[PDB]
């Protein structure tokens, strides 16, 4: 009667919608999936892949050609 409500009272987080928070969540999902990504095995498996190498190049501050050729050779 009482301990039941005591369990259940502090649980709910009524909505917390916050469209600004949504993009942080989206970025965190992308970070997780890219963290499990592996580009060498990906190449071992199109325009998506070019965009992936562009993402790596944007991270490393390198012109795409260098990283593309390195991954290709490896």
């Amino acid at each position: 009667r009482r301990a039941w409500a005591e369990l259940l009272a502090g649980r709910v987080k009524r909505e917390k919608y916050n469209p600004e928070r949504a993009q942080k969540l989206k970025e965190s999902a992308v970070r997780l999936l890219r963290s499990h990504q592996d580009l060498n095995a990906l190449l071992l498996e199109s325009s998506f892949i070019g965009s992936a190498l562009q993402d790596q190049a944007s991270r490393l501050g390198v012109p795409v050609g260098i990283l593309s050729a390195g991954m290709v050779a490896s």
Partner: protein
């Protein structure tokens, strides 16, 4: 007269298009219904006469613009539109040159092969009616119609896709009476929609190689971002089925970026990480998916969404509500052995379900999954495995409180198969007992186990004599669940007899459990440990031979998890001794 009718059709088309472009949620639909009444009355006015050739391409433009705005508002095709097409087709046929649409279309296209200047309106009619047959799943004869439109000696092309590619729009659509949509704009729609449908069907029916081609076709061309997300998600699903994880993940990332609705991608991600065994990442993906689903226009035109079917349960695009996924998280957290986290998740779930009076509703899992008592049981199992037995009693007390009026009056308890008691009542007493065990109360534990056993033997859950209500179809009926649960309670009682020093009673209970469920082996381990304590040699070997003579189907999770909790780690080591 036809000047007035044509100005009226053009007026209602301008009105409908103003409604599409502008307006708010009311004024849009109000203007649309006004235009719809207008086009209905104008079709009545034109059909009142025995219309000739020059009245024909205005009447057909009206009929097409009327079916469009009918189906864009109803948000789905039906047979009134098909009968209107039949009306317009007999109106074309009885001017120049009856039974049904296929032969009527063949004869009308024979008449069009005489080249009357209305082929721009005939192609538009074909677009709408091809949309209708597609959304109605009338796939075979659509090929026949389009094969009759194009050359006849290309009849060997049974595949719809090349035939739809060859089907051209007839003209550049010169200054005719105005229209809501052109046949090329219908062609691209029909292409992507049929490609999507064929791809998804091939995925669901175990062709996740054939599906890629159709889905890449649906990607290449006019593909609204909402549908592009679903395509990428289905390609992720196809790659995950083949084996290829990395291409899958790539498509899923594309879906996340492009999407404003990124639930099904994270669901598929979780289903992938489950194959790889990266359980931590699975739980993290589901944790994100819940927060994602936390957040909550109809154009007067024929778009793809109108034609795509609502998804099934086998599909990768089924994503239920926050509650129906919070239950996935909690279930998958409990199946792995993270029961503390699972307890917090399950209490969050029950808070959502039972504190839902004021705000928008949060539903329970669907009736493939567990019934609403099974959810409480799973919660209490989790709280036991955590070490929160004094909360696993308050769960069970609240469950029996709330269903008192349903419980049997246990006067058959005095009068001692016939009476009815659903499994979850017995199971409640069982968990309620193991809680007291963890708190150290032999007497009241054995009390509760005995109560469970009485309800299990002196009552039948499978009393489908009178269908009186809603009931659990599968979980709280299974004879496998009944026998496993009998065995569970016998064992949980026998261990307390062992604790008390009543090994003969313990032997009776273990023997009975072996008689009940001979294919669990926890029974045999406990029995043989007791016989090795008391009278080793002959009886032990007699049951060894039974085991090797003997040598999971669909159980509920509260039972699976109860067994995995009570079973000892040193089972096989002792059973080879």
């Amino acid at each position: 007269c036809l000047d007035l009718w044509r100005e009226k059709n053009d007026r209602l088309v301008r009105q409908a298009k103003v409604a599409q472009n502008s307006g708010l949620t009311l004024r849009r639909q109000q203007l649309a219904q006004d235009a719809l009444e207008g086009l209905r009355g104008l079709l009545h006015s034109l059909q009142g006469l025995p219309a000739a050739v020059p009245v024909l391409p205005l009447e057909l433009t009206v009929t097409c613009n009327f079916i469009i705005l009918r189906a864009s508002l109803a948000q789905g095709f039906t047979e009134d539109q098909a009968q209107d097409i039949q009306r317009s087709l007999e109106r074309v046929l009885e001017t120049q040159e009856e039974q049904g649409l296929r032969e009527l279309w063949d004869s009308v296209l024979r008449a069009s092969c005489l080249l009357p200047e209305l082929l721009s309106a005939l192609h538009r009619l074909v677009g709408l009616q091809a949309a209708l047959w597609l959304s109605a799943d009338r796939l075979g004869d659509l090929a026949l119609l389009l094969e009759t439109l194009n050359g006849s000696q290309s009849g060997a092309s049974k595949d719809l896709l090349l035939l739809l590619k060859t089907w051209s729009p007839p003209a550049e659509e010169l200054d005719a009476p105005l229209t809501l949509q052109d046949a090329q704009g219908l062609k691209d729609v029909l292409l992507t929609a049929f490609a999507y449908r064929q791809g998804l069907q091939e995925l669901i029916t175990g062709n996740p190689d054939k599906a890629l081609s159709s889905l890449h076709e649906a990607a290449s061309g006019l593909c609204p971002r909402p549908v592009l997300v679903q395509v990428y998600t289905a390609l992720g699903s196809c790659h995950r089925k083949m084996g290829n994880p990395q291409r899958a993940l790539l498509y899923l990332v594309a879906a996340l970026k492009e999407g404003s609705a990124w639930g099904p991608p994270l669901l598929e991600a979780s289903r992938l990480y489950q194959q790889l065994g990266d359980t931590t990442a699975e739980l993290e993906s589901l944790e994100l998916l819940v927060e994602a689903l936390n957040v909550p226009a109809p154009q007067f035109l024929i778009e793809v969404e109108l034609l795509l079917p609502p998804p099934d349960l086998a599909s990768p695009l089924h994503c239920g509500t926050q509650s129906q996924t919070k239950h996935i998280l909690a279930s998958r957290c409990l199946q792995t052995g993270r029961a503390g986290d699972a307890a917090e998740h399950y209490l969050d779930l029950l808070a959502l379900l039972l504190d839902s009076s004021e705000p928008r509703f949060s539903p329970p899992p669907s009736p493939p999954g567990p019934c609403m008592p099974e959810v409480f049981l799973e919660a209490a199992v989790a709280l036991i495995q955590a070490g929160r037995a004094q909360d696993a009693l308050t769960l069970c007390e609240e469950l029996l409180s709330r269903t008192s009026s349903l419980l049997p009056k246990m006067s058959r308890l005095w009068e001692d198969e016939l009476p009815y008691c659903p499994l979850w009542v017995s199971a409640t007493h069982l968990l309620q007992g193991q809680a007291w065990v963890q708190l150290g109360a032999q007497k009241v534990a054995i009390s509760e186990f005995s109560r469970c056993l009485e309800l299990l033997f002196r009552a039948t859950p499978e009393e489908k004599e009178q269908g009186a209500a809603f009931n659990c179809e599968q979980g709280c009926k299974s004879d496998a669940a009944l026998q496993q649960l009998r065995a569970a309670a016998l064992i949980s009682r026998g261990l307390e007899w062992v604790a008390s020093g009543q090994d003969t009673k313990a032997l009776q209970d273990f023997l009975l459990s072996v008689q009940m469920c001979p294919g669990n082996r926890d029974t045999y381990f406990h029995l043989l440990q007791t016989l090795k304590r008391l009278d080793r040699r002959d009886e032990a070997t007699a049951l060894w031979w039974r085991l090797e003579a003997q040598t999971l189907w669909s159980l509920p999770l509260y039972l699976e998890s109860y067994l995995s909790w009570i079973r000892p780690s040193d089972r096989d080591a002792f059973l080879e001794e």
